[PDB]
Structure formats: structure tokens, C-alpha cells
From a paper:
The SAD (synapses of amphids defective) kinases, conserved across a wide range of species, play important roles in multiple phases of axonal development and function. Despite the diverse functions, the AMPK family members display similar structural organization, with an N-terminal kinase domain followed by a non-catalytic region containing an ubiquitin associated (UBA) domain and, in some cases, a kinase associated (KA1) domain. The C-terminal non-catalytic region of SAD kinases includes two short conserved regions, SCR1 and SCR2, which respectively contain the characteristic UBA and KA1 domains12731. In this study, structural and biochemical analyses of mouse SAD-A revealed a synergistic model for the autoinhibition of SAD activity by two separable elements, a newly identified autoinhibitory sequence (AIS) and the UBA domain.
Numbering used by the authors:
A (entry chain B): 9 to 166, 179 to 343
B (entry chain A): 9 to 167, 179 to 273, 285 to 343
The structure:
């Protein structure tokens, strides 16, 4: 691990490095009492903007509170002055394309099993105001039963083949729409065994993606083809929403096929806060203590505003947790 | 793995991805008969420029023919036009600094144990005209005994300024042997201290520190060891210690090498060896090949020649 990074994080002793990249270093953690395996992601906190840290600490608080069978579970977070430590579900089946490579290309039935896992996880996270924004194959981890866990939700604040044109142009984009594009590209790869946009040269690849023209092989069924074209759509306004996707017959036709699907976790019911009076004193207090919410008045404003936001989401998650 | 990559490499079945980065993607491989595990590194030849591809394939050709107990063994090389597949020794003990984290800092005696492994491996590779040039802690793998295997020799052109000598940081022409010595000094310091000699929260300032080359040497570091570190982390590459000097150092003191020979004339060139060299691929310009074999200088062309000659022997 990095120099000066503790040998223990909470009850977890740090063992070998599992992997690393720009968003941090991952080590295997062992619980000192129960000896359970976790993956611990270590993030350097000194090299982040304060606005970034705020956004991150917010998404983190949400992710710690929710659970989905196809989202890598964030169990806890630990902080010292320099390093942030994320305690994550430990999975070791590899990544989704390892499976794809072995098969060459997947049948529409198998591709769709994976697609339903991915869409379900995205729908869930989007419902809690969390977009991925950087969805790519290495984020699609496999457990031992060959089921997906999507990793790295909320890490974006800290590749071009899977990015939508608006991301490639560094424009200000809808996160949900970016995830839809990325999922389209991944669905394509599952069905074809090749990418819709590829080039030996970077500069050329970027233009292909921005242009958004790709060829679909005949062996992709027409129902599925109409789904792919709606997702891999350059006009973000015209691009399918997750709502459109989940209403689509090809999608729906996959329910419990070939196998029964994991239990659907309950989504928290989020309501309006008409006035200061309707805010729970103990939940407000616990939120106010967090750090990213140290300014009580700005916290009150964000909770009472008409806008949907992560402040409201956290509040209702905590409220739900109390009951 | 990468799309378009093989499902089988020689007798090895490709399984899960082990890790990846700029220099390629590593997959777990399983021998279809013996069930022996290997690590298979996949590298995209097409993304590479002309001179880079050649430099890499030349060094891989040397690496596949030699073996040292502290260098990650390269067993073989396979190629489809799109991908190179490097079949490597499989190691899973973690990396050196995982050990360092558990201890905090090493005793001078324990640090010397690792240091001798590292220097031994580099002296072996340098003897075969191979410098690492990009030595960093994550290259220092551990097997199950907590012994070192240095990985990623030959990959530097496919590309951590904390470990790079000032000449490498400055992007100037340099002796690769001298760069490795600097990187080993920084690593040795880290094992003894549990902190880097040059560190900074901002990249720009870190490069400056490395270039100026001033660092704080803790009092608990023994003075003959302290003299070693000063000789290695020396900004003047002409003044910096050689591996030969390191191996004779009082603190330091406490595998078959093949020797390059001269080829005065074309008549001295074994036709079987040349044919094997022609078949490698990193030698497109065959006139340039011959010039390099007949030149007055040590080079990787001669090294490959003599490794092939010895192997036929």
C-alpha cells in the first residue's frame, strides 16, 4: 500500500495490493475478529478540490446507506487527514469481458441476462440521485456465480470507447444519459464480440464516437436493434431514458430468463419538505454533523428547495433508517 | 480480456484478468495439461509507434532467453498481428511495499536482504544489455516466501516521478544503468525510512525536488549505509555509483551469464542464428541488423545473437 497508509482500517488488517489506477489503490482487507474478506479502496484526499471532496462525501453517504445485488456494496468509510478508505464488498470472479472473450459473442438470451442486471443496478442508483458517468467494462465485475457487480459508482469526480459524445467534448451533460450511452456500447459488445466504435488512432476514434455511426450485424434481432439505436444515440435529448429501456419489449422479454433474478431491494420514498416545521430534528442533527453539511443554514436551504438533490436523498434515507 | 484477443495461447487457456495499466493487460493462464498457472500479458501492437514496438520486441527477445531467481521469468512470446502475448511466471504474494506497510520500516539487516535481491537482478539484466529504466515499488513483486521478482523489464517505452532520476525526469539522453541505480537508492531509502526522500502534494514541486536532489537523511540510518545512499541518489550521473561499485560496498558485503563477443566479418555470422533473428520480427530493416552485428559497439543485436548461439550450443 502507499507509504504511511495504516496496516489496519477499522477492524480490517490490510494485506496485499489487489490493483490500482487513477481513482485509488485497492487492497485486500481482513477483519481481525471474523476474518471476512473485504476490498479496501484507498483515496489520496490531499489531491482533491474541496468542492470535489464535498460532492464525493455526499455520494459516499448515499452509497453507504443503500444496497443492490448488482452494485458493489460500500460497507463503510474511514478517514484520516490524508487518506480516505472505502470498505467494499470483495469479489474475485474477474470482469465481464473475461467471460465474453471465452464465448466470442453471447446469444441474445445470455446478453440480456447481463443487460438486465446492469440496467437494474443503474435504475436503482439513478433513483437515489447517483449516476456512474464513467461506465466501462472493468467496472463490471463478476462474482463466482458469474453475476455482475457494478463498481465505482461516484468515483467519476476523482476509456473513450465507452463515453458518449457529450462526455468526450467535455460538455456539461446529464449523467443518466451518459450511462445509457455506455450501456448501449456494452450491450453491443456482448452481442457482437467487437466494439461499435474502434480505431488504432485515438484522434480518429474520438471522431467516430462523436459522429455516432456504427454497423449492426444481421444476427442481432430487430427488436434488440431498435433498442441499441435508441441508446447509442448522439442527440442526448432523443436518447432513450432508463424508463424507455425498461418498457421495451426486448428488455421485458428477459424477466427470469434463463434464470430467476435477484431480489429487488426496496427504494426509499422521497417526499417534499413544505416547511422548516416538517423537518425531523434528530435527522437534521445527525446530517448536520457530517462535515459536508456543517453549514446548517445552507443545509436547511438545500432541504427546503424545490430542486431534487442529494441532500434531500440522504435525509429521507436516514429518516427511513430511523423508522 | 481485450476484445479480439485469443482464448488460448499455445497450451494455455486464458482465464480472469489479473490487472491492467498503460503497459498492457495481465490475464491468468492455465496449462491445459499440467494445470500450471502462468501470468499472460497482452499488449496491443497496433497502438504502438514503429520505434517503440521494435525496442520492446528486441528486449523481450533477450528476456525470454535468460533466467534469474529475482527477475519475473518470461517463458515465451506469442503473436497475432494485433496482440503480443507474454507468457510469464505467475506470482501472487503481493508487492514489496505491502510488506513494508506491515512492518512500518525495515531493520538495516532486513532491508539489505531485499536490496541484494534487487541489485543481483539488475546486475544480471544489465549484463545482458537490459535496463529497467522505470523501476518503481509496484515492479517489485513478492512470491510466497516474500522474495522479490522484478517485473516489467523492457516495458519502459510503453509508458512515477518519485523514483525517476533527474535525467529521466528532464527527458534527456541517459544511461539506463545509471537511472536504475538512482531508482534503487530511492527504494532502499523507502525500505529503511518508511517515507520517500522526495515527496510532494504537487507534481510540479516534486519534479523540482528530485532535480535539485537534496533530501533529509535520518540519523538512525547507519553511516556506511548512509554513504551508500548518497552515492546512489547522486544527481550527477557521472558521479553516481555503478552497480559494480555497489556490489563492493562494505554495507552491501556485510545464474549463467552469456558474454557478447565481436563479429569482425560476415563470415563469422552463423547462418542458423541469423535466420532465427530474421524470423523474430523486431528486425525489419535487415541491412540495419547486419550493420549492428558488425558494429564496434555492444548492442542488443549482438546480445540476441550470442544468446541464440549459446542456446544452439
Amino acid at each position: 500500500g502507499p507509504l504511511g497508509s495504516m496496516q489496519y482500517v477499522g477492524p480490517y488488517r490490510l494485506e496485499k495490493t489487489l490493483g490500482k489506477g487513477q481513482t485509488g489503490l485497492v487492497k485486500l482487507g481482513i477483519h481481525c475478529v471474523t476474518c471476512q474478506k473485504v476490498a479496501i479502496k484507498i483515496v489520496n484526499r490531499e489531491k482533491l478540490s474541496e468542492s470535489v471532496l464535498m460532492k464525493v462525501e455526499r455520494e459516499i453517504a448515499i452509497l453507504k446507506l443503500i444496497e443492490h445485488p448488482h452494485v458493489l456494496k460500500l460497507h463503510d468509510v474511514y478517514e484520516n487527514k490524508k487518506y480516505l478508505y472505502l470498505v467494499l464488498e470483495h469479489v474475485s470472479g474477474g470482469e465481464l469481458f473475461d467471460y465474453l472473450v471465452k464465448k466470442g459473442r453471447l446469444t441474445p438470451k445470455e446478453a440480456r441476462k447481463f443487460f438486465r442486471q446492469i440496467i437494474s443496478a443503474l435504475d436503482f442508483c439513478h433513483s437515489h440521485s447517483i449516476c456512474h458517468r464513467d461506465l466501462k467494462p472493468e467496472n463490471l465485475l463478476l462474482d463466482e456465480r458469474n453475476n455482475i457487480r457494478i463498481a465505482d459508482f461516484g468515483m467519476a469526480s476523482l476509456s473513450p470507447h465507452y463515453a458518449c459524445p457529450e462526455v468526450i467534448r467535455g460538455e456539461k451533460y446529464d449523467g443518466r444519459k451518459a450511462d445509457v450511452w455506455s450501456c448501449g456500447v456494452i450491450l453491443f459488445a456482448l452481442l457482437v464480440g467487437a466494439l461499435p466504435f474502434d480505431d488504432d488512432n485515438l484522434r480518429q476514434l474520438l471522431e467516430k464516437v462523436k459522429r455516432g455511426v456504427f454497423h449492426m450485424p444481421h444476427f442481432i434481432p430487430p427488436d434488440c436493434q431498435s433498442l441499441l439505436r435508441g441508446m447509442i444515440e448522439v442527440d442526448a435529448a432523443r436518447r432513450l431514458t432508463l424508463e424507455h429501456i425498461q418498457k421495451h419489449i426486448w428488455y421485458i422479454g428477459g424477466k427470469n430468463e434463463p434464470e430467476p433474478e435477484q431480489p429487488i431491494p426496496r427504494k426509499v420514498q422521497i417526499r417534499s419538505l413544505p416547511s422548516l416545521e416538517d423537518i425531523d430534528p434528530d435527522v437534521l442533527d445527525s446530517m448536520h454533523s457530517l462535515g459536508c453539511f456543517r453549514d446548517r443554514n445552507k443545509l436547511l436551504q438545500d432541504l427546503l428547495s424545490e430542486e431534487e438533490n442529494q441532500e434531500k436523498m440522504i435525509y429521507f434515507l436516514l429518516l427511513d433508517r430511523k423508522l
